[PDB]
């Protein structure tokens, strides 16, 4: 019987969507800086990025 | 009468009707949803 | 070495297919999922005579599924093995069919035919060398009939060398549901008997009687019916992937079977069937196998030869036997009623032994018979035919498609013919 | 895929779409705004809702129907109502006179200026739409506007895109109740333009209705909501087979060559057997050969016609609900076995017969219990002549006296068409004689 | 490298200027004080808004356009107006008198005293600018000043400079609706001075702006300030390419080479599909397909011009939002398909695509919705002609009764011009009925 309702359909489906998460957060942007070490390479030292 | 309500605020007013609003006659405002708007919004009468 | 390669056609042989290879996939040790599981040699060996090999251990089946309904396919896929059948094999068209044999054989056919035979020949050059085709499909379906007839047609053109073990299941003599039913049938049988070799006709009127006789549970689906069925056919296909002192090939089965090229028809047989208690309250011994193998109640595709007479039977046992209780047992059914078979021909026993017996039992069988019984169902399908014929209702669909009723001539003289030859033959 | 396209005409065909609409909201659980809750089913409007629904990365079912309406005062008020939100708004067409029950008026004077309108919408529909197995259109014979634009409407289509089927559903007129004098006229006008290009054309009485009601019902002052309802869960029934799946599916395809044997005589009748009150489906028990003895009860049909005294020529059964093949061929035997159902010579066979698995449902404040098993049945009959014996012996009397002759032909009509219907009619009643003999 | 240079001449051009740069500000954020967020975009001028504005190291972006009017009243009020601080002074140019809606007043009398100034901002901003593509002028037709002082400055910088491009976009007379019955005086003056060096003229006609409004942002009393936003996010689409990048990129120099056929005739029509409202977008789906249909539908151009009657032969058409390029190479091939466009043989393929994936933004207190796909179309059809036809069978009139020429003759001008000016126009119709017919 768990084959039997195994056989018990619902007809299932999974899809996707966009819109109402690019709206919400539509033209915010979060502002963070940070920093490279580079004296590695035996070139270059420093340089900052953002 | 002995029944319900309708225009519920601001949310209001699908474009289409045909009947008498209060004060749609200072309409140079463009959308119909603010247009709606603010005629509700200004039942300062009382 | 020697291949298969399956059509599943039409909605019904969509899960008579689904029922059927999971059937032959769970008696031959392969999970759900794909990676089998090491258990016995000798299914491990014969194992390619079906499912081609994909890296890793993981099986191909090689089948072809069709059918016009997505949703069909798409629950198909939803089974437990969807994820062992393929994309590859799965074809499909838009449009509605209706169950318009017209339909199925005159305007949309006409354009699937030609992908669904790229993708077959596909495959029939990926293996060796094929003996046949085995087809399952439906006659008093609308697409299965309006498909196969023309697949089995073009195909028989392709190669003239090979075996079309056809599978079509039979409408209830009670009810035929759909009411176009007498049409389909007779258009389809039309060709039929044309191109195909041997054929196996099913009726399930019979499988609800056994419902109520040995499985005797009363709360049945048809998910049972393609059970037996698909056993049935498991059966039939035993003999080639297994070792024993017996003949396995369809071909060594149908030339020794059928004595002349208009014969065509076969009926199904099992063995033993197992109730409530009888599994404790049976002892599987060779007098009632034999017993049940041939008792009427036990016969299940047509109808009871019992008014007409038998022209070649074929038996197959799966088992740890010997020879000399089955010849003594065809002698003792042979000298019993000697009267219901036909002077004609001696020896109208034929006889396979495998020594793989199924999985859960030690000794097995399947029956297979060709009797003059199928004159009462056919003669039915001509009475049907006429009295609907006599007024021409529901016509203005077929002509609007854009044929004559003189091709309906044409059938209803091939089936007649059927009937007379029958006659002439028995009696 | 499988989808239809929804069409609604008429103070008569508004409120009716309204309550299937409200039925067709609870299976996919639309909340009246037309969202689904966190839980995942949108996408391109790609799942069970299909079918009726369109909800693309919007997250709003949007429906594929089409309400059309010439007086804005029953279309306003719904746009007022509940789900307004979730209708389409233009889509809503709306016009500001009436047809004044004149066919007439309605096919002459104000119907040139809205077709180009409902055009350009069906159009913009069918692009998208990749499927569109056919349309679902409601109007009504005897109405005030139902007739004209309606059989305009109907040409058009039939005319532009002739291949694809066309299910017609319909109030016919009551036999001994009138509400409109005009209805003889309007209706034989309808239904003579009509037969040539309808393919299956279902009417339904709404005496009938009111007679169930309060025969196992037992609400004695029912209203609209409770019509609605009724045939609103006819038309779930019928939509069954699209929106889900079962043993063995079937299609309007199926429907249209099946259930007609000939052109012209396309004219079924249904009835709908577990209609039943709440303690009565809770306490009493179902099975398939009491419901389907019911569906076959004389008593129980929306025409007023007696089976016995006419015939039987073709029946299809669609069962919803947990059943098995068994007992449904069990009871259809012996419907065979009994002598009281007259099948014609014609067909041998005749039962069309369909599954599926999903339990028909309740709505919210609903007149109805929960249901395990439901039937619905179709079936094609020849008793349904006497109705249309009945419409012209009655229209006899009228074009004998010529009365209101004056309001069609002063809005601009003229007399050889009303003669020509009548031996229309003439010819349905005498087809349905020649067949319906052996 | 890529900035371009914008003037606007014209109380009738002022609304619009104001308008576009409103815009303008929105999409990087210029507040209009004139810095920015705490967000750190300052420098030389290298880096987004570097093809619109000139940020030095104090951090306030300065608009690269020149602001010319004649009459104080609508610079002064827009100098009054939020943005005069971001604005410039004397890039803001001010006149006492006007043209009288005279073409010569305006291009013999007053401006005179005028270019001298208006020349020596234009060659300041060019000494410091590098990239200098081109040119972007607005002006109107239908202009009391917008035309004299216009086709004086585009002489004087023809004459000056001949190795740029030149972009002019100029709001055409009505076809009916004559707000001044000097427009057939100036109008073809205009022209005709301007044929031999003007290079692409692109037009619009307010009436039909109006006609979209109502028709499908459902507003009953719009405004200029609509209809002035509507023709800024058009040229904001135009620039897209200017602004962001994409899969490929497209500019006015390869619009200059590609669409006009032959010599003289360079006179395209424009269209932008998704004007929509709020609930409107909010709910209703929006793809390639249907806007394509939408934006070649014949009643959605902003010019009355039936498409059928003439002939196309050019197309532009740049995407802006997220659109996977192979179902715009779809939908081009079944627009090719279908029947009911008429192409001209000289050019089987005249389709130019391009693709920005920025999306189109808002305006804050807007009347449009959220887009993730628009359209602008820029194309070339013959049909025009039938505007020519009709201003010169008005001008013939009034000319042949010689109505105000003593106005014109009185501020000091002659007839061989009138003449000239005339069989210029005769020329032209000849030469589209030339390439018209194949
Ligand atoms: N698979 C399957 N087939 C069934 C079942 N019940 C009845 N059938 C029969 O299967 C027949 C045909 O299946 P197909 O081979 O796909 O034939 P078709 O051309 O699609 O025509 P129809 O299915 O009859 O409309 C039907 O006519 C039924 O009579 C069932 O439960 N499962
Ligand atoms: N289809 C349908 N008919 C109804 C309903 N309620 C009443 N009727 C009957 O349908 C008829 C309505 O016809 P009309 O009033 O002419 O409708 P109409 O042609 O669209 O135009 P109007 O007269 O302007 O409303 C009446 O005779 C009623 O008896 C209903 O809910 N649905
Ligand atoms: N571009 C634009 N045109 C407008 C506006 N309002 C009206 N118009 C149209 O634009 C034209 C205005 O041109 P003119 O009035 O000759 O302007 P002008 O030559 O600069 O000098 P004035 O006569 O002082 O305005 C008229 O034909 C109007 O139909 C507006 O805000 N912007």
């Not at chain 3, 046992?317 to 003594?328: A, H, L, Q, T």
Request: aromatic content about 10%; hydrophobic content about 35%; charged content about 20%.
């Amino acid at each position: 019987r768990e084959t039997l309702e195994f056989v018990d359909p619902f007809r299932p489906y999974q899809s996707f969507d966009t819109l109402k998460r690019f709206i919400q957060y539509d033209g915010k942007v979060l502002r963070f800086f940070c920093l490279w070490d580079d004296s590695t390479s035996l070139f270059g030292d420093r340089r900052e990025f953002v | 009468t002995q029944k319900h309500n309708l225009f519920t605020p601001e949310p209001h007013y699908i474009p289409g009707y045909a009947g008498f609003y209060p004060q749609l006659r200072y309409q140079v405002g463009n959308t119909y949803g603010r247009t709606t708007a603010q005629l509700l919004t200004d039942p300062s009468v009382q | 070495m020697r291949e298969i390669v399956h059509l599943q056609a039409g909605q019904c042989g969509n899960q008579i297919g689904a029922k059927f290879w999971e059937v032959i996939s769970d008696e031959h040790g392969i999970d759900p999922t794909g990676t089998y599981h090491g258990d016995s040699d000798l299914q491990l060996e014969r194992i390619n005579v079906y499912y081609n090999e994909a890296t890793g251990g993981k099986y191909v089946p090689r089948a072809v599924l069709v059918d016009l309904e997505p949703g069909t396919m798409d629950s198909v896929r939803s089974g437990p093995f969807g994820q062992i059948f393929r994309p590859d094999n799965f074809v499909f068209g838009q449009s509605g069919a209706g169950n318009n044999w017209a339909k199925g054989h005159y305007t949309e056919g006409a354009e699937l035919v030609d992908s669904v035979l790229d993708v077959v020949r596909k495959e029939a050059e990926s293996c060796d060398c094929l003996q046949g085709f085995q087809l399952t499909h439906s006659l008093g379906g609308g697409t299965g009939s309006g498909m196969g007839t023309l697949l089995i047609s073009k195909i028989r053109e392709e190669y003239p060398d090979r075996i079309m073990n056809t599978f079509s299941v039979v409408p209830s003599p009670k009810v035929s549901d759909t009411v176009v039913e007498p049409y389909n049938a007779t258009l389809s049988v039309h060709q039929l008997v044309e191109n195909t070799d041997e054929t196996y006709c099913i009726d399930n009127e019979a499988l609800y009687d056994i419902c109520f006789r040995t499985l005797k549970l009363t709360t049945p689906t048809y998910g049972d019916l393609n059970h037996l069925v698909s056993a049935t056919m498991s059966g039939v296909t035993t003999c080639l992937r297994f070792p024993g002192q017996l003949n396995a090939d369809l071909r060594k089965l149908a030339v020794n079977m059928v004595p002349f090229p208009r014969l065509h028809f076969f009926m199904p047989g099992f063995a033993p069937l197992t109730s409530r208690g009888s599994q404790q309250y049976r002892a599987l011994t060779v007098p009632e196998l034999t017993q049940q193998m041939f008792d009427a109640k036990n016969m299940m595709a047509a109808c009871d030869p019992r008014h007409g007479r038998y022209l070649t039977v074929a038996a197959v046992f799966r088992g740890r036997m010997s020879m000399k209780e089955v010849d003594e047992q065809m002698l003792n059914v042979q000298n019993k009623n000697s009267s219901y078979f036909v002077e004609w021909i001696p020896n109208n026993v034929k006889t396979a032994v495998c020594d793989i017996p199924p999985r859960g039992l030690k000794m097995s069988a399947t029956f297979i018979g060709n009797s003059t019984a199928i004159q009462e169902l056919f003669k039915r399908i001509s009475e049907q035919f006429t009295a609907m014929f006599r007024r021409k209702a529901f016509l203005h669909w077929y002509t609007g498609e854009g044929m004559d009723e003189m091709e309906f001539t044409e059938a209803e003289s091939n089936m007649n013919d059927l009937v007379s030859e029958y006659q002439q033959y028995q009696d | 895929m499988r989808e239809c396209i929804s069409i609604h005409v008429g103070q008569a065909g508004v409120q009716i779409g309204n309550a299937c609409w409200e039925l067709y909201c609870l299976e996919h659980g639309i909340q009246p705004d037309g969202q689904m809750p966190s839980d995942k089913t949108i996408g391109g409007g790609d799942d069970s809702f299909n079918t009726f629904f369109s909800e693309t990365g919007a997250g709003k079912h949007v429906p594929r129907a089409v309400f059309v309406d010439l007086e804005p005062t029953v279309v306003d008020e719904v746009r007022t109502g509940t789900y307004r939100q979730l209708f389409h708004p233009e889509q809503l067409i709306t016009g500001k006179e009436d047809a004044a029950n004149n066919y007439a008026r309605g096919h002459y004077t104000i119907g040139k200026e809205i077709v180009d309108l409902v055009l350009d919408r069906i159009r913009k529909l069918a692009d998208l739409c990749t499927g569109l197995q056919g349309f679902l259109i409601f109007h009504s014979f005897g109405g005030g506007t139902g007739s004209g634009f309606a059989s305009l409407l109907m040409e058009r289509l039939s005319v532009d895109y002739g291949k694809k089927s066309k299910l017609e559903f319909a109030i016919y007129p009551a036999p001994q109740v009138s509400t409109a004098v005009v209805e003889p006229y309007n209706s034989i006008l309808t239904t003579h333009t009509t037969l040539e290009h309808s393919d299956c054309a279902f009417m339904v009485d709404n005496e009938a209705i009111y007679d169930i009601c309060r025969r196992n019902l037992d609400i004695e002052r029912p209203t609209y909501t409770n019509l609605n309802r009724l045939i609103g869960q006819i038309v779930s029934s019928i939509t069954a087979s699209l929106r889900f799946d079962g043993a063995l599916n079937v299609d309007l395809t199926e429907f249209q060559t099946n259930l007609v044997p000939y052109p012209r005589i396309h004219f079924p009748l249904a009835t709908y057997a577990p209609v039943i009150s709440a303690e009565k489906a809770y306490h009493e028990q179902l099975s398939v050969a009491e419901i389907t003895n019911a569906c076959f009860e004389p008593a129980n049909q929306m025409v007023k016609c007696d089976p016995r005294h006419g015939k039987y020529m073709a029946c299809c059964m669609l069962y919803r609900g947990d059943v098995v093949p068994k007992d449904v061929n069990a009871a259809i035997a012996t419907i065979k076995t009994k002598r009281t159902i007259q099948f014609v010579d014609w067909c041998p066979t005749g039962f069309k017969v369909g599954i599926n698995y999903q339990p028909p449902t309740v709505v919210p404040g609903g007149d109805l219990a929960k249901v395990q098993r439901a039937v619905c049945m179709l079936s094609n009959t020849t008793a349904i002549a006497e109705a249309w014996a009945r419409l012209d012996h009655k229209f006899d009397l009228m074009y004998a006296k010529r009365a209101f002759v004056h309001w069609y032909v002063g809005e601009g009509m003229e007399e050889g068409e009303f003669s020509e219907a009548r031996e229309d009619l003439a010819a349905l009643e005498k087809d349905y004689e020649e067949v319906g003999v052996d």
